Amino acid sequence: DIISVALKRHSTKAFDASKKLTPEQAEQIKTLLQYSPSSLNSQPWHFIVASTEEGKARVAKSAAGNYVFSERKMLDASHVVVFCAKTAMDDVWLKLVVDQEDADGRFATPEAKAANDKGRKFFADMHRKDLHDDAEWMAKQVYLNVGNFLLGVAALGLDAVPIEGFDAAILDAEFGLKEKGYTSLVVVPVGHHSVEDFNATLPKSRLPQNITLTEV
Amino acid sequence: DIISVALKRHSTKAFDASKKLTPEQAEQIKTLLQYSPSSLNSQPWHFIVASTEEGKARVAKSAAGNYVFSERKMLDASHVVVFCAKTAMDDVWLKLVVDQEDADGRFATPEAKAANDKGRKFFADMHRKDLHDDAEWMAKQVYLNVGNFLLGVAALGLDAVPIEGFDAAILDAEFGLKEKGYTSLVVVPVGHHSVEDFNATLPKSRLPQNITLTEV
Ligand SMILES: Cc1cc2nc3c(=O)[nH]c(=O)nc-3n(C[C@H](O)[C@H](O)[C@H](O)COP(=O)(O)O)c2cc1C
Ligand SMILES: Cc1cc2nc3c(=O)[nH]c(=O)nc-3n(C[C@H](O)[C@H](O)[C@H](O)COP(=O)(O)O)c2cc1C
Structure with missing residues (x-):
């Protein structure tokens, strides 16, 4: 069950390079x-999934020097995912989303499709023009995708660690993003932990719900 | 099977108000x-969980203006979670986190605790004092929390919908945030869909991996 997964998962500190995903x-x-x-189903993302040694080495270049402890995790894991965001929400992307929704059969009529598109454009424009965000x-x-992914891979019985400790300007340049x-945001090595993962056996820690949670 | 969960879950458009969480x-x-x-295990969050009629009505004040379509979702669901972020990171919070980690048994020694705190302070200060982000x-x-949550609740067999379509100033004011x-970021009604949830039967749509995903 999923609460077991949530309580048992952890950020892996060292991976066993021999254990590959199936x-x-x-x-x-x-x-x-x-x-x-x-x-809005905006899906404003790109993923780089590095599974070869040379692909993982290219990602690992982003942690050289300043983030050396991130470097090893990225090399040892089976697969390493780089989570990227779009830097701007263009109309081409908005049309791509609504056209894919139409291809997938989500709209009964042209009117429904046009209403969907207009709604999405409206909130996209608000972010860009008014909130400047x-x-x-x-x-x-x-980041929401990352959260979904961390739980998902734990539920599959896999180890992972999310990493903000990398130089996104280097990763960006390596892959011409x-x-x-x-632009690159989070790197997530996935695989199986080694005996040197001291975090596999430490207790979890979170703030108590009496601090973080109000019921009404 | 978490992949089945991911492929079967959906954003609920209408809840059965009589079907409560156990x-x-x-x-x-x-x-x-x-x-x-x-x-950093920074946990920079607060949650409001509304389960009463009174509590849900308070949250649903935020479904005003452009956001009236959110109102029924907030009132009819069993439980409504407001995801809030801290508005600034402070040392008091940082100390709370590390002291909890110590209470939970994560540090063998004073030196290990003090190294943990120093590292967390270093990266927190980088965000607040240097990046100003x-x-x-x-x-x-x-948002990572939200993504974890939406997959989690689906895996419990519950329906949910994430909502950015609410007025955060109204919600913030109502709850003195x-x-x-x-500050309020995302509202997630949780419960069970009704037969008037048109989205429960519509196909799910995503962009193809040939656009979003590079393998290396
Ligand atoms: C977005 C994000 C970035 C993180 N960056 C790092 C990182 O660079 N290196 C690291 O060792 N752990 C990293 N962590 C792992 C956290 O320290 C960890 O999620 C937290 O202490 C809670 O422990 P848990 O993941 O074992 O439940 C990161 C976590 C998240 C969510
Ligand atoms: C952060 C976030 C905010 C959303 N805001 C709303 C909202 O205000 N109202 C709504 O009906 N759906 C909202 N959605 C639902 C999305 O339209 C939905 O996740 C997307 O179309 C993908 O469909 P699915 O969730 O059924 O897989 C939101 C989704 C996310 C992740």
Whole structure:
């Protein structure tokens, strides 16, 4: 059950390089990335899934020097996902979303499709023109995806760790993300922990609900 | 099977107000909120869980103006969670986190505790004093929580919908959040869908991996 998963999962501090995802598992992690929800189904994201040694080494270049402890985790894990946000919400993307919803059969009529599109455009424009927060708004959706993904991979019986400890300017350059309209936010190595993962056996810790939670 | 969960869950558009969470489920959703991961275990969040008629009505004040379509979702669901971020990161919070980690048994020695605290302070200060993005950085952690939560509640067999379509100034005012040091970000009604939930039967739609996902 899912509460067991939530209580037992942890941030892996060291991975066993010999233990690879199965082909089935490697497909499943892609499914999780794709099927996360997002505001307006805006899906303002790109994922880099590095499974080869040379692909993982390219991602690991982002932690060289200043984030050396992140470096090893990225090399040892089986698969390493880089979560990227769009840097701007263009109309081409908005049309791509609504056209895919139509292709998938979500609209009974042209009127329903046009209403969907107009609604999405309205809130997108608000973020960009009035709140001046479109980059942050899209980045929030990517973090939501990360949350979904962490729980998902734990439920599959896999180990992971989310990493903000990397140099996004280096990762961005390595993969030419700026020119493509994306920026890297979180790196998540996935695989199986080694005996050197001291965090596998430490108790979890969270603030008590009497501090963080009000019931009304 | 968490992939089945991810592929079958959906954003509920209409709730059956007579179908309440069980007592155990109401505790389980609180566990999911508490046990989300977060950068540095910073846990920069507060949750309001509305389960009474009075409580839900208070939240539903925020479904005004452009956001009236959210109102029924908030009133008819069994339990409505307001996800809030801290508005600033302070040392008092940082000390609370590390002291809890110590109480839970995460540190073998004084030296280990003091290293943990120093590292957390270093990165927290980088956000607040150098990047000037601590509000955004904290809100990102809250969104991660939401993503964990939506998959969690689906895995419990519960329906939910994440809502950004509410007026956060209205909600903040109603619950006195600003003075308490928090701001409302996402509202998530939880319960069971009705037969008038048109989204329960519509196909799910996502962009193809050939657009969103690069393998290396
Ligand atoms: C967005 C995010 C970024 C994180 N960055 C790092 C990181 O760079 N290195 C690290 O060792 N752990 C990292 N963590 C892991 C957290 O310290 C961990 O999630 C937290 O202490 C709670 O522990 P748990 O994940 O074992 O439940 C990060 C977590 C999140 C959510
Ligand atoms: C952060 C966030 C905010 C959302 N805001 C709303 C909202 O105000 N009202 C609404 O009906 N749905 C809202 N949605 C639901 C999305 O439209 C939905 O997640 C998306 O179309 C994907 O469909 P699914 O959740 O059924 O998989 C929101 C989703 C997210 C993740």
